[PDB]
Nucleic acid binder design. Structure first.
Lengths: 118, 18, 95, 111, 75, 81, 99, 96, 112, 83, 99
DNA sequence: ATCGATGTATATATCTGACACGTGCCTGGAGACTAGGGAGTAATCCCCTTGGCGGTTAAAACGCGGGGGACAGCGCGTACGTGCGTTTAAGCGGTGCTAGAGCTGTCTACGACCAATTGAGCGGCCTCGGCACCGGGATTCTGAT
DNA sequence: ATCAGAATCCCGGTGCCGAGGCCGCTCAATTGGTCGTAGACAGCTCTAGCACCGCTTAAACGCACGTACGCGCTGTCCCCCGCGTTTTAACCGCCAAGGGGATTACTCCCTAGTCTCCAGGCACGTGTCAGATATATACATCGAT
């Protein structure tokens, strides 16, 4: 939980988990994250999932233009010059999407909260 | 929590707050 | 001389001896507490009496007293007051 | 029937007159009926509010090396805890006085 | 079973009573750990009372489930 | 009994009252309307208390008749109730 | 040359002294005359309990002190230390006691 | 199913416009404001008269408990006129 | 053998339901007993209170050349009287607007 | 996305409309940030009581009656929505 | 130069004169509804709002803000100035007792 | 700037009246038992809310020129703080009095409650006129002149 | 003081939708009767509100002085305003779905009401020590030579 961990966590009530980075500790188990969309605030510790990279059997949400609830499973962790893309497989068809453009939902994140909740 | 009166939301310790 | 006057004097001493087993209350401050108890009681009772008609019900139960407290006592005093209310009512129901 | 008439305040483990609150609710013209738990619930919140003011009033009186809580200590306790200040914003206490506060611009400057 | 019982003051007491037992052994495990007679204690789950011979699995009790111990004061 | 007695609230009295509120320097023009504001407050409070006594069929004004008069104005006193 | 405190320090001494005290600040007897003359306009031959007059006074200082502690905020808002009547009716205007 | 009756002051306020302006009308959106005005005002005097019943340890609310309640609520000029209207109506009632 | 049922409002010469006021007072939890003339007094007072507002609203509507009372007219009627202001100091009216007022300082100052 | 800032929805011209209803000539640039905070405090204080009324009613919709009730509880009564 | 520009301030006076006669809502509808449904999530999840309830919340808020601004005008003019600075709102709220 | 002097909090003796307590008792609270209804619960329904889409367009947003308000600095004279001596009246005690508050017995008229009933008042239907709207001219401030 | 020149207002026309009136009907209001008790009233007691007087000194009050401050002026300078152009999301209209508000029916446990016994709390009393008071003093802080 030191500085240099690319953890995925929410940032508000019933929010969706976003992959950031531990940069400073506010206190009382509030680990600040640097999100990849210009957003930076205080995130409580127990709402943070420690995964780097995300496990293979974790269901995620693939994000592209005008996509909200596209459900898929990461089936590939390919490093593209330091930018690791998630291979989203849905109905047997695999597609690659950016680490920036992924979402871990509430139901999909409740399968990991008991393990990586920190 | 705002329902039939309660059995779970009782209390933490004393609310010192100076 | 037979006109009896009710107040909360004895209870204010008796609650005091728990929180502070050594201090005391002047008569002027006892009179202030007597008015404070009556003020809060009337506020909460009026809120509950409205809440009864506000939902077309005709009985004042503990549920809206819990609700009424959450409308008057600000912040986390509301949380602690509801704590004490449920704590007290559960013990009463057990007996 | 008889006997030993266990007191309801003791049944609820409170110190306030649960029995009185019925008499103060039924004759208070608040509803046709009053629930069994309503007086018990009121006797808890009233006890808590009194005990919270007294806890701070005792501390205020200790700071003046006094043993009896004079009305001055009461308002010193009320106007310090902001969460009680909100409760008693429109309340004036007889012989209570005022919190000592001075604006920094009014304070003398020697620079 | 790893279940902890809450009190009205904030004291946690774990009890090792498997999910298919009744309440007689639950209260006995209360006495042998604290020493409070049956008249001076009662158990409440989810707002409803608990019958002494009733099995724990009927209230679908799961792991690490909270329970509340009320002190019954007679006298 | 037709004397002013609104000068009975003397200049050092307003001085003390302001200095309780935390006033350093007071202009000389305050005293002529700090008495008026106080007066207005009075013919409000007594106007209420006298009517309370009227409804009570009374001839004297009790402290309760003033406490309830201030309660209606949102300025409840504590100690006399 | 006798000692002479600079203008503005006895005022601070008095503020610090009256913010610790709790006794009533205006004389009781001239206040009783004022109360009875105000009440004279509603009924004649009205009697007052002593506690009924103490409550009225205790309300009067409570009101005026609250008015002045807003008047100070108005005055420093105008970048001044003196308080002026315009501050009084502005603090009264904002409260809503007149409009 | 069967609908519940929602009692209001809509009918009675029209009778007052015809008393005041026998040719003007009122919109329904503004009509509810006047409907709520009666309810708000009614609760003040009815609420105020409740305390005055207690303040003398009485159990009834007669017309006298409302005369004083009006003087507490209605300020000055309105109070001395509403009292006249109230007393005028009661005097007519007692004769019938 | 009643042979006639004269409404109480007609006996009191009012257009508000004094019969309703019994029901509202008795079911409103103000006292166990309610006097006979108390509802008559409330009905009479409510008559006058709405009568002034409707008197002023019609005038505030005539200058706008409209025969229907818009809530704007109601608020103009209330806020131009110094008495209904004291009655309704804390009352906000739906679709009311604001009284038109610009302070003298904000007015433009050519003053040649 | 999810739970955007959404307080910028009170646009800068909208605040000036409200101010000029009150009769304001000039707006300094810092008023827009403070007005949003005050407005948010007011919404919090009202919606809290409205939600509590709904919860006591054992309902899920926040009726206008509850909003009128919450505003009356604070002394800022509305007229017209009642009923 | 060739284009006709008004002196600053007169357009503000014209807008004040227009908006003090108007009665329509001033805050935009949909963003206010979004704000209301965002705030409610902090107390309970998955609420529903009547159309009339949002309108009541909106127009009460506009009335509150209008009162606040008409107080801030008095505060600013008291300081012998026209522009409103954020200190004016804090003073107005402090005097009302909201802070 | 170090010294003087004033207010102040310092420590100690003390004398009282307000506070804490002991007691009598009586009136309000507790315990049983009963009857009635308000409230909890199940089932239905349709109405109101949520969401989603498509098209116009008013409103929001961004950039720029500038003038007017904000703000800092300086001179002034005047009104106000401060100390002092003089004077009025508050304050305290003690007294005498009675108007009026307050408690008690009586009874009677006024109001709750219940049954029959009927007409005032509410919901649904429908229509037309008062209001909204659009264009076109007359009129009123406005700013460079 | 004088005109372009936008902004605002008023006459007329158009149309549409909601306000006002009608009709049928469910149910709350009226009437009539009984009845219990809330309070109006007379009476008695006795408390405190009122009035007066006298002595004291704290407090108000008028005055003189001088200095900090409110205020006006000026100068600079930035920062909102007005305006134009571009962008966008609000607004209106429409369509489907189902969540839940609202309703009705049913049952029963909870609570008002009544009666009886008993003890918790109040009125009264009494002893005593917490704190106000007076007085000596070390201290700090104020302001200047």
């Amino acid at each position: 939980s030191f500085v240099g961990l690319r953890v995925v966590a929410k940032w508000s009530s019933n929010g969706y988990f976003y992959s950031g980075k531990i940069t400073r500790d506010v206190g009382a188990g509030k680990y600040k994250l640097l999100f990849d969309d210009g957003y930076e605030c205080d995130v409580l510790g127990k709402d943070i999932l420690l995964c780097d990279p995300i496990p293979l059997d974790t269901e995620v949400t693939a994000l592209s233009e005008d996509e909200y609830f596209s459900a898929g499973v990461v089936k590939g962790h390919r490093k593209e010059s330091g930018e690791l893309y998630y291979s989203i497989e849905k109905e047997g068809q695999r597609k690659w999407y950016k680490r920036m453009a992924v979402i871990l939902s509430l139901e999909q994140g409740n399968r990991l909260r008991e393990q990586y909740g920190l | 929590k705002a329902a039939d009166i309660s059995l779970d939301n009782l209390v933490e310790g004393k609310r010192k707050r100076r | 001389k037979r006109s009896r006057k009710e107040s909360y004097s004895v209870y204010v001493y008796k609650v005091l001896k728990q929180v502070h087993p050594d201090t005391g209350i002047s008569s002027k401050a006892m009179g202030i507490m007597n008015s404070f108890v009556n003020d809060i009681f009337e506020r909460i009772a009026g809120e509950a009496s409205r809440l009864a008609h506000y939902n077309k019900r005709s009985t004042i139960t503990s549920r809206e007293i819990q609700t009424a407290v959450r409308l008057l006592l600000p912040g986390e005093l509301a949380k602690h007051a509801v704590s004490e209310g449920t704590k007290a009512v559960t013990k009463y129901t057990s007996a | 029937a008889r006997a030993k008439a266990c007191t309801r305040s003791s049944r609820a483990g409170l110190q306030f007159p649960v029995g009185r609150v019925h008499r103060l609710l039924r004759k208070g013209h608040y509803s046709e009926r009053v629930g069994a738990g309503a007086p018990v619930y009121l006797a808890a919140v009233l006890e808590y509010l009194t005990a919270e003011i007294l806890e701070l009033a005792g501390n205020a009186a200790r700071d003046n090396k006094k043993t009896r809580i004079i009305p001055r200590h009461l308002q010193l306790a009320i106007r310090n805890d902001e969460e009680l200040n909100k409760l008693l914003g429109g309340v004036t206490i007889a012989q209570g006085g005022v919190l000592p506060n001075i604006q920094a611009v009014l304070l003398p400057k020697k620079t | 079973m790893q279940i902890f019982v809450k009190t009205l003051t904030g004291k946690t007491i774990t009890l090792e009573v498997e999910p298919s037992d009744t309440i007689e052994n639950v209260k006995a495990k209360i006495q042998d750990k604290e020493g409070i007679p049956p008249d001076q204690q009662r158990l409440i789950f989810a707002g409803k009372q608990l019958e002494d011979g009733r099995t724990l699995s009927d209230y679908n009790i799961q792991k690490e489930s909270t329970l509340h111990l009320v002190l019954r004061l007679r006298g | 009994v037709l004397r002013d007695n609104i000068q009975g609230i003397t200049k050092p009295a307003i001085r003390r009252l302001a200095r309780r509120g935390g006033v350093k320097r007071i202009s000389g023009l305050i005293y002529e309307e700090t008495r008026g504001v106080l007066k207005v407050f009075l013919e409000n409070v007594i106007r209420d208390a006298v009517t309370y006594t009227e409804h009570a069929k009374r001839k004297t004004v009790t402290a309760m008749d003033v406490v309830y008069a201030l309660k209606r104005q949102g300025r409840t006193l504590y100690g006399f109730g | 040359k006798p000692h002479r405190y600079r203008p503005g320090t006895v005022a601070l001494r008095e503020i610090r002294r009256y913010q610790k005290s709790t006794e009533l600040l205006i004389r009781k007897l001239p206040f009783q005359r004022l109360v009875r003359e105000i009440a004279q306009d509603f009924k004649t031959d009205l009697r007052f309990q002593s506690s009924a007059v103490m409550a009225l006074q205790e309300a009067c200082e409570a009101y005026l002190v609250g008015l002045f502690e807003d008047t100070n905020l108005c005055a420093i808002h105008a970048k001044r230390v003196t308080i002026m009547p315009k501050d009084i009716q502005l603090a009264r205007r904002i409260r809503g006691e007149r409009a």
